[PDB]
Curated annotation (Swiss-Prot):
Job description of the protein: Mediates the endocytosis of glycoproteins by macrophages. Binds both sulfated and non-sulfated polysaccharide chains. (Microbial infection) Acts as a phagocytic receptor for bacteria, fungi and other pathogens.
Cystine pairings recorded for this chain: 2-15, 36-133, 109-125
Domain remark from Swiss-Prot or TrEMBL: The C-type lectin domains, also called carbohydrate-recognition domains or CRDs, 1-3 have at most very weak affinity for carbohydrates. C-type lectin domain 4 shows the highest affinity binding and has multispecificity for a variety of monosaccharides. At least 3 C-type lectin domains (4, 5, and 7) are required for high affinity binding and endocytosis of multivalent glycoconjugates.
Portion of the parent chain present: 646 to 779 of 1456
Sequence ranges assigned to domain C-type lectin in this UniProt record: 11-134
Protein name: Macrophage mannose receptor 1
Gene: MRC1
Lineage summary: Eukaryota, Metazoa, Chordata, Craniata, Vertebrata
Localization in the cell: Endosome membrane; Cell membrane
Subunit structure: (Microbial infection) Interacts with Dengue virus.
Length: 135
């Protein structure tokens, strides 16, 4: 079961919460990770298409599209490539076309484009974004 405002009550329920903020309250990737971890959770990992649907549904209920959200995607070692901050394997991927491209060699964190594509892009970790936590 999920906490109130994070999901449903069934044993298989996955718990996510959107944090959409104005520019003066958006956070870097590391700040967002720390915020979610302070609650006992982490930045959201999207481990399969079912979790993707869950998050997309939350976005539709928000009444706001096209927003960008930090996910728990962070680059590891050169041989690892991208990892999830919660330690789960990156088995499922939904990178946008041509991503991750490490554009200009400065893109080590992953963001979700909150539109129907639900696609991922690697971007500079110091950008200020909205974020999604899990618990
Ligand atoms: C898919 C791809 O390689 N896109 C390149 C562009 O990078 C993309 O857009 C920028 C603004 C940033 O969001 C990147 O994280 C993203 O991958 C790049 O700007 C452009 C330069 O001419 O080349 C594209 O191919
Ligand atoms: Ca990129």
């Amino acid at each position: 079961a999920c906490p109130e405002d994070w999901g449903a009550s069934s044993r298989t329920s996955l718990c996510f919460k959107l944090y959409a903020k104005g520019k003066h309250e958006k956070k870097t990737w590391f700040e967002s990770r720390d915020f979610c971890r302070a609650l006992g959770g982490d930045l959201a990992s999207i481990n399969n298409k079912e979790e993707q649907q869950t998050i997309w549904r939350l976005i539709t209920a928000s009444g706001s599209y096209h927003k960008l959200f930090w996910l728990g995607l962070t680059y590891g070692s050169p041989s690892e490539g991208f990892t999830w901050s919660d330690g789960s394997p990156v088995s499922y991927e939904n990178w946008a076309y041509g991503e991750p491209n490490n554009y200009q060699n400065v893109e080590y964190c992953g963001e979700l484009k909150g539109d129907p594509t639900m696609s991922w892009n690697d971007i500079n970790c110091e950008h200020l974004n909205n974020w999604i936590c899990q618990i």
